[PDB]
Amino acid sequence: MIQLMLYSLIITTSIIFLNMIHPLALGLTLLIQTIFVCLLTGLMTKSFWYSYILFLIFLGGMLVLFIYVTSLASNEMFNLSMKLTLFSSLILIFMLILSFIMDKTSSSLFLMNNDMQSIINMNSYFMENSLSLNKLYNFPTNFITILLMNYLLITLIVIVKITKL
Amino acid sequence: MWFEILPGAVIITTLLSVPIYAMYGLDKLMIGNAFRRNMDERFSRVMYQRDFRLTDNPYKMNGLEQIPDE
Amino acid sequence: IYYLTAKKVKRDEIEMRSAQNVIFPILVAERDREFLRQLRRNRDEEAELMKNVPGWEVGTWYGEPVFKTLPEDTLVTPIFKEFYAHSDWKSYAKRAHLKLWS
Amino acid sequence: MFYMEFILSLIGSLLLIICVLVSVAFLTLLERKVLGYIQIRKGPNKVGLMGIPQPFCDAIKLFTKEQTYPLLSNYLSYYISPIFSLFLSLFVWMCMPFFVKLYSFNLGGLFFLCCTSLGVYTVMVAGWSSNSNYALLGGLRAVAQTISYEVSLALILLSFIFLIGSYNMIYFFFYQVYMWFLIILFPMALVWVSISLAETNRTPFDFAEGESELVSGFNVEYSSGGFALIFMAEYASILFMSMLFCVIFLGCDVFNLLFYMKLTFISFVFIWVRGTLPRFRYDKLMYLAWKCFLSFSLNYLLFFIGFKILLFSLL
Amino acid sequence: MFSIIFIALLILLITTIVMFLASILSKKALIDREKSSPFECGFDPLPFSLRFFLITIIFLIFDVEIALILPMIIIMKYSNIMIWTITSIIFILILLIGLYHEWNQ
Amino acid sequence: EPKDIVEVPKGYVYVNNKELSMEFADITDRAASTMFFGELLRGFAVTLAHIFKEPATINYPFEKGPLSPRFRGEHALRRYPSGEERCIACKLCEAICPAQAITIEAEERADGSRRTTRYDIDMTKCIYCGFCQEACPVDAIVEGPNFEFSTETHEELLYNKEKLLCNGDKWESEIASNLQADHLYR
Amino acid sequence: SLLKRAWNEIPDIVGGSALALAGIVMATIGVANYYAKDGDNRRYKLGYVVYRHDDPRALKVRNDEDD
Ligand SMILES: CCCCCCCCCCCCCCCCCC(=O)OC[C@H](COP(=O)([O-])OCC[N+](C)(C)C)OC(=O)CCCCCCCCCCCCCCCCC
Numbered sequence A: 001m002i003q004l005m006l007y008s009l010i011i012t013t014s015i016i017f018l019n020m021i022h023p024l025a026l027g028l029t030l031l032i033q034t035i036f037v038c039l040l041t042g043l044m045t046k047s048f049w050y051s052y053i054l055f056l057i058f059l060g061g062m063l064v065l066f067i068y069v070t071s072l073a074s075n076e077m078f079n080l081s082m083k084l085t086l087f088s089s090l091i092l093i094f095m096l097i098l099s100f101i102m103d104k105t106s107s108s109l110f111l112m113n114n115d116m117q118s119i120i121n122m123n124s125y126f127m128e129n130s131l132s133l134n135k136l137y138n139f140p141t142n143f144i145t146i147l148l149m150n151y152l153l154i155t156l157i158v159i160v161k162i163t164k165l
Numbered sequence B: 001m002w003f004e005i006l007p008g009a010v011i012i013t014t015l016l017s018v019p020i021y022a023m024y025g026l027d028k029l030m031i032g033n034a035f036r037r038n039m040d041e042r043f044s045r046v047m048y049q050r051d052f053r054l055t056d057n058p059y060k061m062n063g064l065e066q067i068p069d070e
Numbered sequence C: 001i002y003y004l005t006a007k008k009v010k011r012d013e014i015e016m017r018s019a020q021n022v023i024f025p026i027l028v029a030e031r032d033r034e035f036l037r038q039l040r041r042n043r044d045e046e047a048e049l050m051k052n053v054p055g056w057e058v059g060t061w062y063g064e065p066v067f068k069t070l071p072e073d074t075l076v077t078p079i080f081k082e083f084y085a086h087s088d089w090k091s092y093a094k095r096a097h098l099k100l101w102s
Numbered sequence D: 001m002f003y004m005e006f007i008l009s010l011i012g013s014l015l016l017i018i019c020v021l022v023s024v025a026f027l028t029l030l031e032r033k034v035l036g037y038i039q040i041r042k043g044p045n046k047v048g049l050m051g052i053p054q055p056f057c058d059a060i061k062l063f064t065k066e067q068t069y070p071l072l073s074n075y076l077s078y079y080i081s082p083i084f085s086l087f088l089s090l091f092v093w094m095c096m097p098f099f100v101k102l103y104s105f106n107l108g109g110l111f112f113l114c115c116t117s118l119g120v121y122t123v124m125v126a127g128w129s130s131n132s133n134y135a136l137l138g139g140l141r142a143v144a145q146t147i148s149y150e151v152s153l154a155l156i157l158l159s160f161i162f163l164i165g166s167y168n169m170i171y172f173f174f175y176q177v178y179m180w181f182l183i184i185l186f187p188m189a190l191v192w193v194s195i196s197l198a199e200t201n202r203t204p205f206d207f208a209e210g211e212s213e214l215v216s217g218f219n220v221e222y223s224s225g226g227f228a229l230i231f232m233a234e235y236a237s238i239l240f241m242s243m244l245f246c247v248i249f250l251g252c253d254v255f256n257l258l259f260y261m262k263l264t265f266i267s268f269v270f271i272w273v274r275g276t277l278p279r280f281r282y283d284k285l286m287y288l289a290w291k292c293f294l295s296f297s298l299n300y301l302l303f304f305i306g307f308k309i310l311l312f313s314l315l
Numbered sequence E: 001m002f003s004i005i006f007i008a009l010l011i012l013l014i015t016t017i018v019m020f021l022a023s024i025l026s027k028k029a030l031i032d033r034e035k036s037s038p039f040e041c042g043f044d045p046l047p048f049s050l051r052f053f054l055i056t057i058i059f060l061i062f063d064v065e066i067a068l069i070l071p072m073i074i075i076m077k078y079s080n081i082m083i084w085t086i087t088s089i090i091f092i093l094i095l096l097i098g099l100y101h102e103w104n105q
Numbered sequence F: 001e002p003k004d005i006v007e008v009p010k011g012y013v014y015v016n017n018k019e020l021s022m023e024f025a026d027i028t029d030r031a032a033s034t035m036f037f038g039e040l041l042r043g044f045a046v047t048l049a050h051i052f053k054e055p056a057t058i059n060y061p062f063e064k065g066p067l068s069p070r071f072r073g074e075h076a077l078r079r080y081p082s083g084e085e086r087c088i089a090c091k092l093c094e095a096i097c098p099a100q101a102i103t104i105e106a107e108e109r110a111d112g113s114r115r116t117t118r119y120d121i122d123m124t125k126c127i128y129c130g131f132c133q134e135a136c137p138v139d140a141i142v143e144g145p146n147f148e149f150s151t152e153t154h155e156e157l158l159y160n161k162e163k164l165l166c167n168g169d170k171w172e173s174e175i176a177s178n179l180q181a182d183h184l185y186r
Numbered sequence G: 001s002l003l004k005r006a007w008n009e010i011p012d013i014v015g016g017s018a019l020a021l022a023g024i025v026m027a028t029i030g031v032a033n034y035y036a037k038d039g040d041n042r043r044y045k046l047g048y049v050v051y052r053h054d055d056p057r058a059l060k061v062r063n064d065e066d067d
């Protein structure tokens, strides 16, 4: 049910993202889309680690650059329209009552949670967020995360050169 | 003199002591068990599921009186 | 002092893990018996429901088998949507939404 | 699934929100009182009896004054910053270590870092929508210091998580059953005090929201209820930093009354450094956040990497 | 997580209701030309800064770097010890060498 | 004891003239004060010791702070012990008033006296300098002890002759005590 | 010299580098102590782990007393 609520909220924020043109308003629409995307990717998974990782990296880490650039880009304020708010509310109530009149068992995702797994599954009882993150720090896939940290340092070296400081 | 700060501080000590202690009363009222069941490990959630399967109150005990005589 | 405290915490969690390993096989056998019984009633419900759809037999997708290159009497566990089929949404969210609610 | 868990979680969260808000009001009273006693002068008095309903005198006044706006035409973006600020300050408290179960936050440090990473967002919409160059300068300065010590705070708490072996906040209790972490982490205690006075704008890190170099950084156009919500959100952040100091370093001790006495004492310490220290500069604060604290963070994280490897062989 | 959505929506609803009642309780006077003006001290009245932008970029690079330091507390009891130590020492040592090199240059 | 960068002369004192010490004991002392916040600990201790001090708040208006018998407050017009007004309309106070607040208009009275028909002091213009009581040959105009005379309205601070005479009638005891205890200094 | 200048200007970084060198030394000490014994065969397994006597892993189990 709440997965369908997040579907409806993402649809509504995407169509208002298509409608609006003010750059900080699109930045605000992105920062409120990232929360719903984080929660909706939290519904399929065993545990909410990667939603937290996407949260710190994308919203609190990266989009603040977008919010700063779009804040200094536009001198003017938002022109709030009650027509777009009314249309968003109408399509939101329509999509929630459409989720009310729809069977939620067929519309639920087939991806297993931590409790949707079998009871006799030995690997699920060990430690939360342990076996999924294991391949980051084991042979031979540790070279990718070493290359990722090197890639981030090289990215900073690129950014200092292209902005010319 | 300097003991007039303690009107403004000890009240801070009381109010923030409220949201646990009242629950330590309140879980003893409607549940009967003072602590709600910890949902950190998956085995605790499975055994809580087993209790709520066995009885409609998961904090109600199924002791040795449930076992039939044989 | 932190080493002594970590040793105490380690022996406490090893005690809890050993108690979990004691409790586990009885619950595994109980789940085994209920899983086999529920598979029998699910097969019976699918057999009685599909008595009018042409070209349908129980266990295969319209005649074509689901799993090949397997022994003829093997068993694979059905998926959570197919096992919790023939049931309301409240039984699906009864099990699937225990971690998500608390 | 048993419904009294939902009912008691709702009741406990609303009781936590109410008690946090009244403790915010009495924390403003405590700060005005003992901050006076930092100097020779007395604190609030003469209102009600012995100055006790002075924050209610603040609340009646701030909820009655004219809600002025930085421009006359469109000012709905002016509204959304104190709403989200008070929402985050009352929402961050859900990761408090409760021994009786309220929310089973197995990743509480990540939740705290998320709410701190929104602190930059509410102060950025505070700065931009107030239509003034002082407001934009204060918002940019606050975003600068808060993202400058966000990385440092993440590394310091990441070094602390190596001690308990997991991200569960209640695991701070079991590793503090014999001694507090103030003994083992005293330079980390001083660094964490410098961190917690930087994310929340206090006097040692006050170039963002001071009354000297700017008249006010991002509260310059906020008044008549918006300033009240912003003030309550900032003092709730002070209360959260006092609690989070008292969980990590001092023993969690959630039930004991000595834990809340120590929480009031760390709030007293926050008001004690409010009256003592002067204010850092932009260049010296970029020097502090990215070189000294970052180097100490990575170095003593290496120290706990070696120590947790050394104890893993011995245990 | 479903209880967290309910309590966060309740905090948002309570704060919006409190602010709406504060806007009703606020004393409504005649709106003015000068009262709506942005405040500059006294007499009535910024470009892009690259240094703050590279401060945000350094914050972003170190934030994505911290997001790879985050998992290894859990993995320490469930991985190869030599590989984990080599990756952790190499990770923080290359971070420290890069920080000191960017300090010196 | 650090050496002097600049040789200090006899009649002067030099600040920040000490050389920076280079022996290892002083370097370790400065290093520990930098790392462990020792000077900040001394500042915190000095700050915390003032909580235990006596507050100097004098609790207005039940307890009022010290004044002096020479204190300059509300201007007032005195009277003789027989009851005749002291002000002989001699106009040295208006001639000496630097803000020119005093306006005097004088006519001969019925018995032949010189006493005023108009004596106005603009207390919004008066700077409370006390030149009028020094320039008064009789002790007519005087600086009263009163300073709690804040007004709601701008016109109420325009003091007439009747307001000054009422101030002289009201405040006569303290003004006479101050003039008895202060006349030999002047 | 050079270490006196670093101890004069930047003493916290010198102390942190001493702590990091000590942590690297005791990390190598912990790795050598872990691999000196049979650290790959942990005493307390997770889950329910059983071996029959025909398995080669059943001959490598630890019969040490609980510490
Ligand atoms: C109950 C307690 C009562 C007393 C305390 C009450 C208050 C509670 C605590 C408050 C603390 C203060 C908070 C605000 C701080 C404001 C000042 C500030 O930020 O200063 C920054 C300053 C800035 O450094 P600085 O002083 O070098 O920089 C200024 C000088 N210039 C710019 C010229 C270079 O200090 C630091 O950042 C120091 C680093 C962190 C602390 C030291 C950690 C080092 C590693 C551990 C020890 C290593 C081993 C040593 C032994 C072996 C050696 C080989």
Ligand code: SF4
Residues within 6 Å of the ligand: F086, F087, F088, F089, F090, F091, F092, F093, F094, F104, F132, F135, F136, F137, F138, F140, F141
């Ligand atoms: S100097 Fe004295 S006596 Fe002369 S006119 Fe002035 S108040 Fe009257």
Ligand code: SF4
Residues within 6 Å of the ligand: F075, F093, F096, F097, F098, F099, F100, F101, F102, F121, F125, F126, F127, F128, F129, F130, F131, F132, F133
């Ligand atoms: S005190 Fe000075 S300013 Fe006032 S009336 Fe006397 S001479 Fe004029």
